[PDB]
Amino acid sequence: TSYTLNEVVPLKEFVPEWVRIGFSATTGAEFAAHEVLSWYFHSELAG
Amino acid sequence: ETSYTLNEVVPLKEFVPEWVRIGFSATTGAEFAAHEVLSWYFHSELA
Amino acid sequence: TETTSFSITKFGPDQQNLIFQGDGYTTKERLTLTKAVRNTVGRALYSSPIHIWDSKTGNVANFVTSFTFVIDAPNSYNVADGFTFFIAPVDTKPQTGGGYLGVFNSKDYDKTSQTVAVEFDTFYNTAWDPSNGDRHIGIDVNSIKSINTKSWALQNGKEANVVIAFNAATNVLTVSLTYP
Amino acid sequence: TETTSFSITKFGPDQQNLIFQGDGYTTKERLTLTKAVRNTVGRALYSSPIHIWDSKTGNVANFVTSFTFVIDAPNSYNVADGFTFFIAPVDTKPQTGGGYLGVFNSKDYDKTSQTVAVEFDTFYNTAWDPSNGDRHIGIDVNSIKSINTKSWALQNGKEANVVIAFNAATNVLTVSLTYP
């Protein structure tokens, strides 16, 4: 079962030149355990 | 086409912590020279 | 040219290449962002800064990330708030908890936030979520109010594999989640 | 399985994924560790800790690194002190300058050092360097006195391409320096 979403987001208008990436999760009045099992990342920036 | 190779068995697990930082250093003392790095590529894989 | 790449297939007890914030920590070879307890936040950041664009050339990076995650709720009705993958300033710290997912503070566009997140939202917050009340995948830039959303049916305790990719030439951010 | 990778084909003035120490800085597309100036120490570290071996399993990592560097001196006679690629604890700080190359403090073995360095040494320090007085590539573990060295002729002002590889199956560290 898959779900796909695509959007144009010109990142350069929104984030600084240098960023840290990561995951976030919260609970509030209601809750669930949130867990990541594996993670691969790759970025490339031409110069 | 001028090359210099040195090989040596170094059981790193005996000398260094599990988690390390890697990098470069250079120094001058009473004599000197400019020491510059133009590019750097690294890849490690731990199973 | 600059590239940064890494992969972690199994999380150890001391995963020193991650910055943990809030209650995030690693356990049973998983990164646990929250336990099943009320009112918590957990974040984990890769330790190296990533160069996403450069002002002297104007070039912008492509990137790809994929991860598998599990949301484990008691029953599929008592579940909140969700999970995010985000891109933020190097000094990012936990923001508001609850339905703001630890990443934003307002439904009002805040240019000083300069964080974009792809959220996997499990709880409908009437003030900003899609009116239909569904769980959804959304793309957020500078507010908790997604610019766009796709309804998603949570499969509780099931692993979801997601790929998120951004291509600088077309500025297109592509999100894909699959339950295998 | 854990992997860490990066390349910086060209250093810019704002290289935030490097930690700079002593007088090392980045300029004119170059990382400069030292200018041609007396009495300085410059170091640069990659910002992410890397997992080189694991005590839970006893596995150790394979890694390879490549870099190209330039030593530029007034003339070929008065050249000092050298350049190192090193591996050290996460909280590593500059040690003694001059002949100790910023990474060690003694010619005596000290297991508290926990540093191994591959050095490209251009000045002959009679207390520990090869008695032939030759410029040399050396492998240092916990002391500035190399456990093995190879003579190298400096081509002053020319760039050298270095590849260092470690193979965990055999524990062999291979170093090759090539001028065009």
Ligand SMILES: CO[C@H]1O[C@H](CO)[C@@H](O)[C@H](O)[C@@H]1O
């Ligand atoms: C009902 O409000 C509280 O709980 C929900 C669900 O957890 C969160 O969205 C919200 O921000 C508060 O924590």
Ligand SMILES: CO[C@H]1O[C@H](CO)[C@@H](O)[C@H](O)[C@@H]1O
């Ligand atoms: C004369 O001794 C000094 O200068 C040389 C050459 O720079 C260094 O090797 C040494 O550590 C001292 O600083």
Ligand SMILES: [Ca+2]
């Ligand atoms: Ca919500």
Ligand SMILES: [Ca+2]
């Ligand atoms: Ca020397």
Ligand SMILES: [Mn+2]
């Ligand atoms: Mn939402």
Ligand SMILES: [Mn+2]
């Ligand atoms: Mn030496």
